[PDB]
From a paper:
During eukaryotic DNA replication, Pol α-primase generates primers at replication origins to start leading-strand synthesis and every few hundred nucleotides during discontinuous lagging-strand replication. Pol α-primase binds directly to the leading edge of the CMG (CDC45-MCM-GINS) replicative helicase via a complex interaction network. The non-catalytic PRIM2/Pri2 subunit forms two interfaces with CMG that are critical for in vitro DNA replication and yeast cell growth.
Although Ctf4 was not included in replisome reconstitutions, we identified a 3D class containing both Pol α-primase and Ctf4. The presence of Ctf4 likely resulted from endogenous Ctf4 co-purifying with CMG due to the extensive interface between the two complexes. Comparison of the structures with and without Ctf4 revealed no substantial changes in the conformation of Pol α-primase. In budding yeast, Pol α-primase is tethered to replisome progression complexes (RPCs) via interaction between its Pol1 subunit and Ctf4, a trimeric scaffold protein that binds directly to CMG. Although we see no evidence for the presence of multiple copies of Pol α-primase in our dataset, density for Pol1CIP was observed on two Ctf4 monomers (the third monomer is bound to the Sld5 CIP box), suggesting mixed occupancy within our reconstructions. Thus, Pol1CIP can bind to either Ctf4 monomer while Pol α-primase is associated with CMG (labeled sites ei and eii in Figure 2A), presumably because the CIP box is linked to Pol1exo via ∼200 aa of largely unstructured polypeptide.
Author numbering:
A (entry chain 3): 18 to 55, 90 to 331, 338 to 448, 455 to 568
B (entry chain 5): 21 to 104, 131 to 198, 205 to 213, 235 to 303, 320 to 335, 348 to 415, 421 to 455, 460 to 524, ...
C (entry chain A): 1 to 5, 44 to 177, 181 to 299
D (entry chain C): 1 to 105, 119 to 208
E (entry chain D): 2 to 35, 48 to 201
F (entry chain F): 75 to 104, 122 to 221
G (entry chain E): 1 to 58, 68 to 144, 158 to 193
Write the structure that this text describes.
Amino acid sequence: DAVFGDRVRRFQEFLDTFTSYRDSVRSIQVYNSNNAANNILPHRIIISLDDLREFDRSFWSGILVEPAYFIPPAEKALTDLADSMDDVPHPNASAVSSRHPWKLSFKGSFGAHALSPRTLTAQHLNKLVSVEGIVTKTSLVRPKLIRSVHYAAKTGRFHYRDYTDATTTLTTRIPTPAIYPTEDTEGNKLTTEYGYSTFIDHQRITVQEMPEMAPAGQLPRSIDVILDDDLVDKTKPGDRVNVVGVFKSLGAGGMNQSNSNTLIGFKTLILGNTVYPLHAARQMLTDFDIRNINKLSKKKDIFDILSQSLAPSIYGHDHIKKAILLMLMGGVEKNLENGSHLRGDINILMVGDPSTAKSQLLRFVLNTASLAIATTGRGSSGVGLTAAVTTRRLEAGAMVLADRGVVCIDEFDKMTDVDRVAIHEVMEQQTVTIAKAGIHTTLNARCSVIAAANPVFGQYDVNRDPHQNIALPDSLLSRFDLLFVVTDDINEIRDRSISEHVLRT
Amino acid sequence: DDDNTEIIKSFKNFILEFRLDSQFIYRDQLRNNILVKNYSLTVNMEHLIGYNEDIYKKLSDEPSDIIPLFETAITQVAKRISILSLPTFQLILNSNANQIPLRDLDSEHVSKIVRLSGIIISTSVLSSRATYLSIMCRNCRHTTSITINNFNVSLPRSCLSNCGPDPYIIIHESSKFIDQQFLKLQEIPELVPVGEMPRNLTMTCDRYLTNKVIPGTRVTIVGIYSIYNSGVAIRTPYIKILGIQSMFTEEEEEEFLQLSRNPKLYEILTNSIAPSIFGNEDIKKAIVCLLMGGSKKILPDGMRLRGDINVLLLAKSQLLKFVEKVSPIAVYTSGKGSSAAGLTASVQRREFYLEGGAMVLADGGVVCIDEFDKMRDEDRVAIHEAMEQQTISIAKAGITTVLNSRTSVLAAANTTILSRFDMIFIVKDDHNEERDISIANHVINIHTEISIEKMKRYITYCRLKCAPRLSPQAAEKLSSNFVTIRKQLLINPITIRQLEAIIRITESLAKLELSPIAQERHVDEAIRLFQAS
Amino acid sequence: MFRQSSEEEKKLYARLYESKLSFYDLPPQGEITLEQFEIWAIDRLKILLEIESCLSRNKSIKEIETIIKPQFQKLLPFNTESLEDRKKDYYSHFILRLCFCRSKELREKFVRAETFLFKIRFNMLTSTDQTKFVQSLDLQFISNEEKAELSHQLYQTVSASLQFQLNLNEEHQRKQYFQQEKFIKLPFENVIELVGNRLVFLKDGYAYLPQFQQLNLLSNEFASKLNQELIKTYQYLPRLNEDDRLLPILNHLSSGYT
Amino acid sequence: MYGDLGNKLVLEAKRTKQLYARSNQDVNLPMYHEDIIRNILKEVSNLRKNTEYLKEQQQLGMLDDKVAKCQYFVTLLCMERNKRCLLAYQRLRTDILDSMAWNNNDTNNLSHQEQEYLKEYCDLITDLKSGDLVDIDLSGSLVPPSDVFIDVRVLKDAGEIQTEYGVFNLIKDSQFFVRQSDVERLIQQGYLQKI
Amino acid sequence: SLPAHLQQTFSPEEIQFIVENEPIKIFPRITTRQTRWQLITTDDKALNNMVAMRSTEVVLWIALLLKQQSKCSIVAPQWLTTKELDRKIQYEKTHPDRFSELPWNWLVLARILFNKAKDDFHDPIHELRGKIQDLREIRQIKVLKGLKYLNESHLQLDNLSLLEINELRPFITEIMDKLREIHTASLT
Amino acid sequence: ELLPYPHQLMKRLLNRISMQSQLIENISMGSKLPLLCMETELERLKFVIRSYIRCRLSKIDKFSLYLRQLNEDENSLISLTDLLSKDEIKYHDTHSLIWLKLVNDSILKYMPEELQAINDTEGSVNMIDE
Amino acid sequence: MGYYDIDDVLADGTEFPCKFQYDIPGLGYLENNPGRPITKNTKLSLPLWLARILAIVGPVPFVELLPPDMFSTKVMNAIKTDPVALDLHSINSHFFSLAIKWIMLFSEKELANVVSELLLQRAQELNHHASSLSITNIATSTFLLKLEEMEKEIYKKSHESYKDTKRWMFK
Ligand SMILES: Nc1ncnc2c1ncn2[C@@H]1O[C@H](COP(=O)(O)OP(=O)(O)NP(=O)(O)O)[C@@H](O)[C@H]1O
Ligand SMILES: [Mg+2]
Ligand SMILES: [Zn+2]
């Protein structure tokens, strides 16, 4: 028992020595205290595991090899630091007994304990580990009881009690029956005070090894992770993610009497301590970026510089490059006071001869837009391109997924008439609506469309009408802001210039 | 009580004393294992029998009871030869006793050491078993511990420090565990009685024997044959395993380098391809280029330049089989495909799902199609993306995904689809009676230049070592030729998508010589071979 | 097996603060400034004034520790490697000797406040530092046979104290601790405050004291030696009177206690 | 840049060293890289032409104090690093040839200067082996003598042969019991095995 | 010129050659005392003046040369007995850092005499072969502890045998040299 | 380093080897066992000298330019003939000329006059090993 | 560090980042354009045998050396947490040669203390795998893929030494 106190003292020395963590405590506290008088930041701090190594190796290896005996006292010391710093007086009834300490998180240099779901092994149980993979399933969020408060009717005394379960604590304790006490030790009838009691959020997820690493077409392997309080709902299926936490076992493993002859193993989990995403889009500007951006904007011809810097490996087609740049910037979306909506996003279509860089230029947008989805015109159905029913649940299509982004459609001329007419709403009302057996709902789809097609006769025929060359209805062509026609006109100097260009490339 | 100590003493004296000639083979093995942090020992039955037959008799009568005693004896020796802490060591066995066919195991064999063989057909994921385990007593809050071992247990009920009827719980925070895995063994295919499907068994292994085999491999097994609970007075059988049996050198690349400097290497490789087929020189040349390929490139603005080659053939059945044999990776199919996925991919149904055909499955290698005209309707349109983009993309029934299709296609048949290929040629025949007689004589013989493996390894080496670049002279030559053909056609089409194909052929020709630069010598043969027509 | 094989002032203060506390045992050497003399004395004086104020307000050790500990980082640092902090602490104590040796009331007030500060700082130590500090001061444990013979009486004496001071509510835990605990034998007059509270076992004029207690002996030795040193300091105040530039500072320092 | 060819040439030195070290019996040092060496020497000649042109511009007065000094100095370093690569490569192949000369005392892979070098070094070895100190066979065995008499079995039909101790008739798969000091050379030549 | 594996070290053959020059005690079965031996790297009187069953001292290589035939018998060294080896093992266990004071050629001489002279021992040979192994194992533990003190300056060793040193030579010297290079580079 | 040659010892040893060889021949031409001892002793003696001289020649290969520079220094505290035997002197001198001719014609013929020296100390890397 | 040593010849050709302190005519071929000058505060990647001189010869010398990525802070923390697990072969093929050259160039004290510990801690497992002789391949082969070119020579000359001794004894 006495060792717990010394570990609290030693972590207090660390917190006094490395002062950048005090500023973090204090800044969170003053921010929360400001807006409370009118969002709120979590009571959580991330420590560099390297600082702790350079401060005390004996505490560093203790955190990293015996977390059940070192993480709790360290976390206790952090709470004492935050509690001794000044705080707002006269707290309310719920604030007085919140049962809410501060919590830790870690970064840097895990060494041998940086793992993947395939290689996590029984040797690593009760160690602090870091794993990487893809989220495949997520449970619903549920509340969990940890403390309850009771008012005794006759005596006027407020009583309370605490609860525990195997996933709530790093150390192990006798489980609690989840019963509410109805009667006092002295026979007084009790009442339960909701709002003074404390409940916390809980969510389970599953993480699987990345398909790029799967051997020999073998079955892939996966782990379940437990999240709570602030960590809930920060992920969704398909996310690539890196998780930090303690690897632990559970239950009786069939040694409590069972038919299995104990061949079955014990259950295991990772208790989520920290979660980080992986980039596999967004960037964050530094001060120097703001300066450079503002200075560059005062050149005489910024539009030419920027437009010519799009796809420099493609010769010619200046105007299409300028149009793509204006599409990536976009207009301004208007919502009037009576609820009426006016469109902001620009749609572009280009039709032309074979080999004239249509698909190659269309491919560039997919690798410079922040959110982009790509599809071929014949590989997609009307419902798959907008939305479909399943089980009732309604499932989104490609135009619904790229909401505030761009969608690229290649081989647009091969799309059937039955598929094209599903798009007429999405390019003006920017919504999708379904009315099918057991469902009625509206969905948002605000994207910009860019697409490429082949003319009717296989090459553009100037000796026939544009409507004869472009077999699409007038109501659809009207929805594209800019329609570009492009051709491979044979000429000596043009051929020479292009061929020399691709050879230099 | 004393028997447990005499047996341990006996196996301890076995390890410390068994010499064959002048080396204490088990002392040396046990020391050499610890230095690489391997905690196990591989004993051989014949040596145990030679040392003292009585010990083997005890082991043969009661293996479930005696194997743990020998394991703890190993631990007691391991400390003396390395300390002036260690886990319990795993014992592993080798044997030459008569194999039992899997179909003959029965009630006479329960709790006996058995040796058998078969094919592994399935493998479980790993799971955790306890060895050292700690206990908390709920009432008095006293604590104790237990040591499990995995041979054929439950939590005790003798409370300590009344203390209650069932007061014990586990402290997982201070306990030790090991790995365990399950496998399935199927009887040998050449043993099964006619008209019956093969019989199979289930089996278990732990610690160093885990994660040692994969599905489809033939294996030999030594293990205890026993039963477990899962009619009247009836139980399921299984096996506890105790043992299992199942880039270039310098001298290699020196040969490949000697080939690379041969002045007639191009002729040699062409001659080595389907040598029974008469004539068809340019077909063989084109297959060499298809096997060697161009060079992949990536630009600062992120655009990506293709490396593969594509060829079409209009006798012809033999060449695709030859290409399948010589290529480092290969897939063979007929135009209808192996499933409703067809060549490319499709959506099927109950929830919907997606599966890929023989374009996705050949990713990274070569694929050859035996009748391209028998391609299905969906594949006719989908192959455009598969060839131009090296991808297949689908957005149907709520599925929204993109698939990789990075491959070189060889195809044959007997229209606008010819535009997808880099080269097209028509197969030619000759009717010499001696050729047919020679083939017939060889057929009777079975009924009564460079070799394939060396050529395949050479192709692999060249693909790994070299990716050559155009010299400036080649650039002037190619551009002048390009504008010349377009001008000639204008006064009487060629397009950039074909210039970029001639470049890939040129690079593939320079690749045979391992020359880091391509030269006019290669450009000339490239345009000479471009006469598909 | 294989095998291989003024500065003095700075070393003195490194030696004096290796234990993290000192009885302030030795004559300082070298020089500091007069501004430093005044400021360092005032800083220690402020801490001791607050200690005496809290004691006059009858606040407990925990409350005083909560009040005084934030002041060390500003006025008089502790648990520090800095030579400047160590010299500041040492010199400020020595200065206030010369301020507070002047009269019995001043000596008593200074001894009380400084001994309580000593207690506070000793509580801040780890047990290893406490052991090393006690061992450095050259400060009789009973035999195991004597402990066994007196085990019933010693356990009856300390069992309540183990429960209330060390939170050992379980009798099993108290028995295990008692089995591991050492005891000290000395004349009862040396620990009379514990005698009056019946916290120690008495036999034949000797008091039997467990090792987890007895800090009052350490602080009483500190207080007694400080009182004797102050009496000595008083006897050679006529030598202090040779530098006039110090007397106004010392008069100012003492005025806040009169 | 001017060091790329050298960085490529030295990799062949590292390669031939590892190939040689792997198998002491299989020594056949590979083809001399005449073309790469010729390209390196042509590069040096280009740099010499540039320095000479720069000296002409210096005599013309074209900012020669700073400009000619820095450009000349930088060019000098590029020449020195090429000299180092060429000497390293040639020195390695020389060490291999010296090793073979001691045992031997075929030619197509050696350059002609190397072809005469080997002959010169053989003359030197036989000069040392002759004259004074002749009593000890400097090209003989370096393994200490273990036994006087051994049993040797007859591996190749060389027929009847003469040796300083006497005459032998090497009937295929016959066995001799004979003193080692006699048959040491025949074991090295490969007609015999020790069994 | 010289082979690559002999640039810095002695092979075990050379170690055997070095050990073979030591003297050893023998009982001859013939009298030579009244041709003569006329050696040039040793004494010649002892071999010329032998008398049957009279103990005498000669170099080890000649002793093994005689013992190849009936004419001689070799007396084992006194340290090569069960009592002494028991005491040395006890010394090894008692002092967990010092090496026991065995002669510098103990491994080589034991593995020569067990092959050439298995018949001339008094103790049962199957026990000596065990105790030699016990000594080598304990010494290997002590060596593995010592390789954590490789440093920039020096090391001291005591009673470590010639063959044991020669086994370790290319590792100790190389790692020590690189630590020296790293340290002196910071001084310069 | 290359240690100094034992001039006197080698003279006496080689003379003794010659005399012992002639004695063995005379006794052979005139019990078997003494002859066996004499023959194998002479083998054991010759092996050591052979190994020793081969090692010294190998050291001379590696430090040829260093030994030449040590000899060219007029202020050197030791002369090259003090350190080496007469046969070693011959080997060092002629081997240096053979190696020099090979690189001089092949490489250095093409270099400018500032870089034609083979034993250059002043360059960006020292060409002399020691 | 001999003249004719192949590994030293090959290690000096690794490139380091550099920045110029003067504009100079005609030396644009360093920037792969022979027809142009170099200009002040331009940044280039140059081989060490050249950068080692242009950083010294004058006053202000022509080039300044920027801190390279193979001596970054992340690598130092990786070294200090677990030296035995570390994949130095992927970091740089010739790490312990370039480390000594850089130490000589800037006379670093703390880097020497880090590198000495790294070498001493990796030598232990290297000796373990050297001592372990068959009477296994996977267990040894996983660690021996993380050795430098410098460490491989020590491993080879140790393994051969143990093996020759073992062969002679049991013979
Ligand atoms: N400046 C250019 N102009 C035209 N084509 C170019 C140019 N630069 C490269 N190309 C190549 O032109 C080829 C065909 O480009 P691509 O974008 O697929 O044409 P496309 O308009 O999609 N033709 P299609 O697929 O038949 O509709 C590619 O291999 C490009 O690399
Ligand atoms: Mg296209
Ligand atoms: Zn109990």
